[PDB]
């Protein structure tokens, strides 16, 4: 989904994208938000990798009954 937060707008009359008031719309992205999202996603990725590795080891050792 696209973020419902209102997009930013800057003043630039010499641009064909500008509306009747000379305002051109720019995306609303939180750089810090994206950075911490990448950090958290990477850490959760690592945790899931470790879980999968441990479960695979236990499954492998189960067959030695």
């Amino acid at each position: 989904i696209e973020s419902q937060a209102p997009e930013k707008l800057v003043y630039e009359p010499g641009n064909p994208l500008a509306d009747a008031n000379g305002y051109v719309k720019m995306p609303n992205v939180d750089v810090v938000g994206e950075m911490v999202n990448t950090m958290s996603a990477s850490r959760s990725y690592q945790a899931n990798i470790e879980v999968l590795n441990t479960v695979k080891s236990m499954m492998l050792k189960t067959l030695t009954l």
Partner: protein, 253 residues
């Protein structure tokens, strides 16, 4: 990046202000020139969040500053004597009318007239004065009274002969005139429909012969404004510097 954009807008506004200050200072000795001052305004405001006794707790982010207009102070300048006989000065309101080469009509204010080879009255630059006053040869003396009548004397003539009248135009709102280069103004939609009149009637001015109208530029005001512009520019650069520091630290960590 929002801080960068806002500070960029502020720097551009200060640049334009310094530009108009320098323009006012440059032509401090130009006849019939009026100073200009630039006025700025704010942009739209973002409403990020809508709003016993506490603070209202509402957010409202600004956007920046833009220049809106440059108003010309159509005041009255001083009169300096050039001792010439074909120079006139306006006392009050009113603009002369001259004809551009293409065919349209533009208005001027300063008076410094020469006579072409034919005899007609033209300004310094070749543009012919619209009322088209013609001064024949053997013109011993030329007289331009407080009214528009121009009278030339001749050899052994009891009374001078009239060779025309210099009517001048008036505008409902002179601040809205468009100022093309070379001390000329052209009518626009902002200013009302011009009306011509003889000097001294319907609020028009009076013609003084042998004087020119100097520009009304206030040097002390311009210097103070220039100092303030420089200091504001130095202040605004700090915003860019701090935003750069924040972004660099964020990238590093």
């Amino acid at each position: 990046i929002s801080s960068l954009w806002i500070a960029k807008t502020g720097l551009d506004a200060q640049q334009t202000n310094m530009d108009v200050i320098a323009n006012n200072l440059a032509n401090v000795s130009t006849n019939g020139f009026k100073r200009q001052r630039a006025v700025f305004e704010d942009l739209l405001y973002q409403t990020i969040r809508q709003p016993q006794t506490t603070l209202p707790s509402g957010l409202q982010i600004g956007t920046g500053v833009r220049p809106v207009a440059t108003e010309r102070l159509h005041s009255q300048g001083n009169l300096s004597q050039t001792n010439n006989s074909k120079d006139v000065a306006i006392k009050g309101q009113g603009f002369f009318q001259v004809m551009l080469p293409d065919g349209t009509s533009a208005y001027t204010r300063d008076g410094s007239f020469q006579v072409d080879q034919n005899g007609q009255l033209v300004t310094a630059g070749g543009f012919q004065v619209q009322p088209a006053i013609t001064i024949p040869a053997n013109a011993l003396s030329i007289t331009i009274g407080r009214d528009g009548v121009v009278s030339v004397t001749q050899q052994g003539q009891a009374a001078p002969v009239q060779v025309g009248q210099l009517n001048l135009t008036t505008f409902m709102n002179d601040t809205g005139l468009e100022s093309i280069g070379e001390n000329l103004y052209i009518e626009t939609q902002s200013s009302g429909a011009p009306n011509e009149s003889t000097p001294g009637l319907n609020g028009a001015g009076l013609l003084y012969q042998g004087y020119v109208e100097t520009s009304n530029v206030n040097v002390a005001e311009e210097l103070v404004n220039m100092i303030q512009v420089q200091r504001a520019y130095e202040i605004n650069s700090k915003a860019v510097s701090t935003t750069d520091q924040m972004l660099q630290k964020l990238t590093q960590l």
